[PDB]
């Protein structure tokens, strides 16, 4: 990664064994659960395209997801080139950002230039986009099929609801359309009458309190 | 977070993997036990609004609590925008503190300014407010249900008593009342006779020593 030292200069450092191992274990343990992506972004803080490829390549299994990721990168790289035809510095191609046709020196060059071309952050943006597709794909259930069990505690139901909703993501609109209507609707008859009686504007805290028995 | 380098300036540093792992494990293991909140505050020392969102987003389950937490943040952000209506510098609105409408650069700008606007500390205060609500809501037992067993040591009873009292987060005066009345009253006959033989105003050490 490219970090600022104790002296205050932006230098390049080798990715740490602890970071390498952390990312590998997270994938092995959490697979492609939604919380893996914020973990990835945090572990790849200030990463070069080389560092990003290192993290991805270290992944042992999930090659179907890795292949899907490659396809997404190829799409974004191609779309980058269509938007960028050609002492002034050479701007990166789609393959340069992905670290395919660019060296570490060139990657460091773009990132530490003035003005900087954040090829690391641009690449990570493509990867996270790809990771979002995989998370949405590895989602077991549809949000429409999340219904409260007859004897299931309301809290446990809300947990499954927003867990599924998170994995599915949306366009922000569908999230808001479901979070109030779908959540109350798919609740069991007893909780449903209480929640619908509470009316809109009722906080989740108020909802969970009323249906806690 | 923002730390101090060898040049005496406050610079930004990437959140460490050890910190990332520590926060995730304490949530998976301790859930929303009361002692998770001080651990959060400690692991998020000098954290930016971005770092705070990073730690929150790394939480796997408990999406019911995370959703409640968002609502708390929304309530506090609204109140901030009410109490703060709109080369003088632009002051942050509610969404800027929550790291929603602000960038890492802007966050560092506020925190390292003179005088500073601790957007990270203000945000963390909002978060801890929400975490307090969750802990209290997810409190398993009431203080009224804590009864010393016929074979239970006094220490193990007092342990469950104050562990419950901590999670309930009652008002200060209420906690005093429970300690004075409920603690002695709900003890087994053996201890209660000994405790009453020590008279009122006895310290906890004196109570637990006498029933050892």
């Amino acid at each position: 990664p490219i970090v600022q030292n104790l002296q205050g200069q932006m230098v390049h450092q080798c990715i740490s064994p602890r970071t390498l191992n952390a990312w590998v274990k997270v994938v092995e343990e959490k697979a492609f659960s939604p919380e893996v992506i914020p973990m990835f972004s945090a572990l790849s803080c200030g990463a070069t395209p080389q560092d990003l490829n290192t993290m991805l390549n270290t992944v042992g299994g999930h090659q179907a997801a890795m292949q899907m990721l490659k396809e997404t990168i190829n799409e974004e790289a191609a779309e980058w080139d269509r938007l960028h035809p050609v002492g002034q510095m050479r701007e990166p191609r789609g393959s340069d950002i992905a670290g395919t046709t660019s060296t570490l020196q060139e990657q460091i060059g773009w990132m530490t230039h003035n003005p900087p071309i954040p090829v690391g952050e641009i690449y990570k943006r493509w990867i996270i986009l790809g990771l979002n597709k995989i998370v949405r794909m590895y989602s077991p259930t549809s949000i429409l099929d999340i219904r409260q069990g007859p004897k299931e505690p309301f809290r446990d139901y809300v947990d499954r609801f927003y867990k599924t909703l998170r994995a599915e993501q949306a366009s922000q609109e569908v999230k808001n359309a479901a979070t109030e209507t779908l959540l109350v609707q798919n609740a069991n008859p007893d909780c449903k009458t209480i929640l619908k009686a509470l009316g809109p504007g009722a906080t989740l805290e108020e909802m969970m309190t009323a249906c806690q028995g | 977070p923002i730390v101090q380098n060898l040049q005496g300036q406050m610079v930004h540093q990437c959140i460490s993997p050890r910190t990332l792992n520590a926060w995730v494990k304490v949530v998976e293991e301790k859930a929303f036990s009361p002692e998770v909140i001080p651990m959060f505050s400690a692991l998020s020392c000098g954290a930016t609004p971005q770092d705070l969102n990073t730690m929150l987003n790394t939480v796997g389950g408990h999406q019911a609590a995370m959703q409640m937490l968002k609502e708390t943040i929304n309530e506090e952000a609204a109140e901030w925008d009410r109490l703060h209506p709109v080369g003088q510098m632009r002051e942050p609105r509610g969404s800027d503190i929550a790291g929603t409408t602000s960038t890492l650069q802007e966050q560092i700008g506020w925190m390292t300014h003179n005088p500073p606007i601790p957007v990270g500390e203000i945000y963390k205060r909002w978060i801890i407010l929400g975490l307090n609500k969750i802990v209290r809501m997810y409190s398993p037992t009431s203080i009224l249900d804590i009864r010393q067993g016929p074979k239970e040591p006094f220490r193990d009873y007092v342990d469950r008593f104050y562990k419950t009292l901590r999670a309930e987060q009652a008002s200060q005066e209420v906690k005093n009342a429970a300690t004075e009345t409920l603690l002695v009253q709900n003890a087994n006959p053996d201890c209660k006779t000994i405790l009453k033989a020590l008279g009122p105003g006895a310290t906890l050490e004196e109570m637990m020593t006498a029933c050892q």
Partner: peptide, 13 residues
């Protein structure tokens, strides 16, 4: 409304 349900913390509108 800074945060909306299902959307990650610190996510811009």
């Amino acid at each position: 409304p800074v945060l909306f349900p299902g959307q990650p913390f610190g996510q811009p509108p």
